[PDB]
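Sync notes, pocket subgroup
Present: LS, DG
LS reminded everyone that the earlier model was apo-only. Rerun requested with 5(R)-fluoro-beta-D-xylopyranose included. Inputs:
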Amino acid sequence: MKISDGNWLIQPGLNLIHPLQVFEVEQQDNEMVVYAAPRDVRERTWQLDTPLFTLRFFSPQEGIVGVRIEHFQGALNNGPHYPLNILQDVKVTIENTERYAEFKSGNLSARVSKGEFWSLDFLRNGERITGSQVKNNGYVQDTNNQRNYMFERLDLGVGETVYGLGERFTALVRNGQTVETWNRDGGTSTEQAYKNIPFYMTNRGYGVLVNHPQCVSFEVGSEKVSKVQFSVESEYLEYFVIDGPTPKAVLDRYTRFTGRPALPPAWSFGLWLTTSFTTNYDEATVNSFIDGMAERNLPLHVFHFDCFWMKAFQWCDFEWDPLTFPDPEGMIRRLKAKGLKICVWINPYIGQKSPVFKELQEKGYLLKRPDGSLWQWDKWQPGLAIYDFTNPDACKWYADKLKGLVAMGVDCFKTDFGERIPTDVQWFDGSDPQKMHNHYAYIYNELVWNVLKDTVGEEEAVLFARSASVGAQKFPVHWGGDCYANYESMAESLRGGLSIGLSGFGFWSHDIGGFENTAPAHVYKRWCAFGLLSSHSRLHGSKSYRVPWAYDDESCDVVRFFTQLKCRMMPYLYREAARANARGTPMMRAMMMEFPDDPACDYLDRQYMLGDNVMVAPVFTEAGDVQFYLPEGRWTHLWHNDELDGSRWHKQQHGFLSLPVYVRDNTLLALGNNDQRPDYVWHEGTAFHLFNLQDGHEAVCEVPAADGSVIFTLKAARTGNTITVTGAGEAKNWTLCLRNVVKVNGLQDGSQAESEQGLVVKPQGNALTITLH
Amino acid sequence: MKISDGNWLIQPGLNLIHPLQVFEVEQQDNEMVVYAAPRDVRERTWQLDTPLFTLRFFSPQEGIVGVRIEHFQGALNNGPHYPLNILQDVKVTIENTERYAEFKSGNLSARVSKGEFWSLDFLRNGERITGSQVKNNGYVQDTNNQRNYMFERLDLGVGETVYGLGERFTALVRNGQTVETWNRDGGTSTEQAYKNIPFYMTNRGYGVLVNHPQCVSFEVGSEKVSKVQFSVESEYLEYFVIDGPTPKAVLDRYTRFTGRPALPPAWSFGLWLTTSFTTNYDEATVNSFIDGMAERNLPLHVFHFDCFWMKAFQWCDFEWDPLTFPDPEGMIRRLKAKGLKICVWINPYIGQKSPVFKELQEKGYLLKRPDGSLWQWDKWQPGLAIYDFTNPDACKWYADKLKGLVAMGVDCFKTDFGERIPTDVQWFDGSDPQKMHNHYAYIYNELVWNVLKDTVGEEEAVLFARSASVGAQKFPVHWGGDCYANYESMAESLRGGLSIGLSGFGFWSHDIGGFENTAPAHVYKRWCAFGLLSSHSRLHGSKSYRVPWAYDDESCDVVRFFTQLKCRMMPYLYREAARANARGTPMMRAMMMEFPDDPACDYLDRQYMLGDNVMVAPVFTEAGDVQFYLPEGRWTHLWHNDELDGSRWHKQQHGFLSLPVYVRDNTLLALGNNDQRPDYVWHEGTAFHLFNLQDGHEAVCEVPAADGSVIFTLKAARTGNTITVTGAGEAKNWTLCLRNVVKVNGLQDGSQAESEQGLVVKPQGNALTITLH
Amino acid sequence: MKISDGNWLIQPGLNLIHPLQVFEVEQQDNEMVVYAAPRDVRERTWQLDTPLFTLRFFSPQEGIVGVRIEHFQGALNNGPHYPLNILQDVKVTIENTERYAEFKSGNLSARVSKGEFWSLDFLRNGERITGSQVKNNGYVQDTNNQRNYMFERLDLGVGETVYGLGERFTALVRNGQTVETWNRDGGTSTEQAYKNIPFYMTNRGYGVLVNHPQCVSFEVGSEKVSKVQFSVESEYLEYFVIDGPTPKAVLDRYTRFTGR
Ligand SMILES: *[C@@H]1O[C@H](F)[C@@H](O)[C@H](O)[C@H]1O
């Protein structure tokens, strides 16, 4: 929202008042309160007839500093409120002195300057990482529309860049843009988003969550170029500064605070296939696709039934279209017998044509307007109504239907929609419509998740969700929505995936091949590599099927190659997934996140890091040309084994069976002995691979159990020409390949054997040391 | 302006119609007219009751394709219109086939697809650099405000970045932001700008000029992330695609098309001096100020009389304050004799308090509202009126006043202000107020410029302009405006300077230390280096007294050091300036411009190239820490002589007398034998410096004459271990230094001598040849 | 109420949507439901993001066919309602073929044409006495006052004359006049009336009652010269076609239906 009109003026009709001077500092328990006047009040003749801002500083978690700035406390302030994890006994330090008032949690502190020259500085071990200058926060009275806002402007230093604010499709670095945290169904090609999160972080080691579920309006370097301005229509503004000093540290605190990404079941990492959106389909169609996959040796693990599994115009009354699917449970058991997992489409709305509608209306389970009538419109479905999830009985009714599908063999759900929630309505529990808009995504997803958690069990729960709100990262794997089948759209989609990881979400997916339009073969090919090298992979389309043979023969080879490669990577991949669930580190990571101190990584959005050790750069050209940057070190292509010197840009050309996939040096990777499924005993038959272990370093590898815990650890430290190898845990018949190492000098406790990738060592007893030539 | 509401909807109240099918193509001389319908009109029954767009393709210059799409031609469409150089005899090819219609100029062509699939594509030798997809242009009928717009959306490909749109201070790469081309006096810390230009260019080698003086609203990847949208309130939209393929080539065509940067006289390159804004002074005060500089051996060449050479509140009636300056011409001619040039402040407004105000009013030389009363207000001045430059007699009155000053000894003027032009007025010539807003800046500066042309001569002409419009780049050296005294603001300022060069402007100046605020010594020192390593530099402010030693003695050395340096660099500097004049290549170049193929240079804004051969990276920290990227090659620090390897980022620490100033390998640089003044016989005593001439390469150095032409060329070609040195033209007592070259095997036609920077050779026979060791 | 602006245009600020194609027919006991889309929805790609009308045919009395066209069913729709005599056991015939969907009570039937050419027809012994042509019924969304209406236009043949609509003092034959069924105290010399009845009959032996107590706006050959148009501010429209074949027979049924 524009407040200023250039450096010298203010927008017409706005009256601003700012806290310009500290009047009094009070300590209440472990919280610090600061009273600030809009003017000089050192004279008692001025200590009256004036507004007074109440700034409260507190800490909900170590390293997190909460700032609450209030105007009037008499406001109603109804919920819902974000699902924050708030501790009341965090150890903090409050020092109120002559010149300053400082609140401190861990290494992060908020310091207010007393005296004439007001100032609010956020410090990390004494140094200022950001803050608010005088007159850059306060209250706004909009005379034009009778609305009142609170606002803040946190500084940005030279070269400081901003990231996050949910899954957004605009340029990766927020600087220069306006963003409104407001869930909208606007595709993947605009400034709109299905997943808004009022949280941002910078390449300076800290982030900030503006604690308001209603629309927050950010001007990221868009009004005042060197600052991040945010405003909300409220009588108070509350935000949390979250300390790093690294992007992963920020996310770790952020997710501990708002919610840890759950760990999805191993099978969910397999290949997903869909009937597609408005294409035709019945059981025969299903089996045709499945037999088609098996026939061409294309591993497939999850099959998804989209919208038309239900009668048109009756969408989400949960009843199978009898004409297209005469025997639902029969058809599902046969697919499962094949070792496949099943997911069906659902959403939180309901068309009037459904016979269930009248029942729901009679019971008051649908969202009503103030006058008591039903809220309805004709978008998506004719006479569409919304399930009122603030209504206990409506929740149970919805959930009972979902349990009916599960008891039928269904293993998970695709939670589509949930963003276009109206405000001209009256919720059953009286919540504030402006806050229910964004938060609805959370309530919807939380409801479905718990049905899974109470049936299939939490270990087995996973969803495919299109919308979200703070805290929704707890119900894993969200997908980038409705993209188009072209390179530009594939790129924009990658920016969104990267962005959402920068917002606390650990698992992301996208429609391989694009949703709208039918992609030419080469595009489909490139997208397939990108898709399989993502935490979650799904072949899904709008008006055309996504089966590889719908494009060409080589497409089938591309799909098989990458699907196999992914299943062979699960020992590594599933460990990087346990990290998302432990520290909120997302599987797909922006380069700036993994290499925070490298200045060349700031604007990189066409490449990413998949887990801690491998850099993947999708190809966005027909010819196969691709440019990517590599951080310091000597990287090694994952299967071509060629090497590249880091800390510079590289240009290559790859055919459809390749793309840059480079492994960091000093890495010990664990590849599995199964390229047909993602879920299998990873610590048996394991094949370790050591990449450029330097003199003086130690590469560590942890192999996980199906539950994510480390069942076996393997370390390789190199002192001189001697590299010692030790393992701890449970592992059977494993191997250790010294990448690009032709011959060895000696080998204690182990038999060796050449390989095209390098010497392969077999462990004999305990010591398995090797001497380099 | 927001047109769409996400991928699937349109903004409420907006009715859209687009050209969706070609109906007929026609050729009229060297122009192609395409009639497009908003629907299928193949049947005669639908060839009625429907709108019909008329698209016209033409070419004003080789390589430039103009596109004019219009709805109703009945509108008034009054001037002013940009000062475009339009040729009517440009060789073009027009092809009208069954499948396509194509218009071509140079290697660029416009192609419209006939049939069911409408498509507008711009091609460079058959390859698509950009275009407009079906429904991404057309007419907008705003039902909410009765306003009608025309809009276009030109595609951006993967990794494509946009630059330009005037002197702006937001992030350098426009992707993700919206910009309105409307002059405003909004300072240098926000999205507003004093100098707006509806011209942008990309890293794909092409640019586009939206030919509308009124306000053009750009959504650069902000509405449709993969497209640059632009709209204007009009019944027609006309834009020009300008071909490169390199950034420098686009600017070459753009400046040939809208105007070439004039070549500023050599003296204007010296250090400019101004005694703040609010200082109290008279003649004795001025001299005692100049002497202070001379007394500390701080060379000065231009002195600027700001605001107060006139009586307060009477600003710009051209009357010297009678009390403060009893004898104007006497003081100027005395200052002149001290080896100085005189510049004075002026602006296009006039205060009520001035005696002249009534005269102008009774003569009708001031801007009037429709009712005939004078337009007035109280910002900056009380009852401030505006000179009506569309009035032939008012222009003459103002012009004569300037000639009066010039005849008094004034050499140049600072044309301040000119941005806040009201639209609820009625110009003398009846121009369209909406278009006069931006164009006023052009008229204003053009009038002034021509006064100098007609008095001191075109070669002596120069200004310090704050506002600008398309075509204003012909009135050289535009000034960066009022900037704050901190590092973030020093950076915002560099971004603006880079941006203006990327908009057709060849010369940019800024104030050392800033305008507002009180800057700490270190900030002042860092800015001094950055300011002298610019095309035009000025010591100035607004509050503090303009004395370097008021800070500390170091501030004085810094100013002396970099002022001497710039003067020595004039043989190199004035040559590059001739380039701005001939090819529209700016002296201060963004990296992306000099190294268009290096993917590491896309987002670099904290460094720049000063001329073809030298990279300067200002220091933005107190401690002196600085990180900068170096392109391919072995770079050498201009005076520290140290070397660095390219294609990578470097971290260094510098004291106040230094900063990263690196010279390119394979470069022959010419240094002057005078470090006191900028204007001197550069081709005498010249000091050439050869930097890492590689085997099989050649280094050329063109030493310019006063008028900018090359008076002496020196080439050094290396064949093996034999570098041949040949010269052509007029030169005397010159020398050649082999940087980092101590011992050399042999030498022909010349003697040698050792140096700290490397061997120094002296010619005699020109058959001068060196043979390495 | 004026909906059209001549044959070719629509009144400003009005957005219309009409049932143009049958999408599904369903018999519910002695009642027939017809779902019609406002556009071609034969392809699954168009079976979303579109309004959908629900027409229900029924019979409260022998020889009377009730027609209820609905948009949103979420409206409050509070009482009171007319004192209608509604029987639940009227003997009717419902035949849903591939070409038509027909509901019959007594010698009167309502027939909807499936396929590309939508048409709602009322037949007496298989012959057309009146009916609604494509785009002559539907929903009106008034943007000028944010009000929404449902409307219908029942055909009038050559020489067909309309009567009734209460105790009115204008020309006996309604053809050519607009009449609002809203009780007013306006004397006996104007278009106003003390006793308004949203019931009309013709010299063709059939009558129709618009089942709406609120104000019903009738344009009897005043907007569309060959049709009797009636609109009401509601999310649903419900009228009853009453078979004669003689005026006295129509009244017999009408009074047996509303009161003797
Ligand atoms: C929700 O809408 C459609 F139903 C589905 O096909 C799509 O993948 C998702 O965006």
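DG: Residues 1-245 of chain B form a domain with the Immunoglobulin-like fold (CATH 2.60.40.1760).
LS: The radius of gyration of chain B is 28 Å.
Action: DG to write up.
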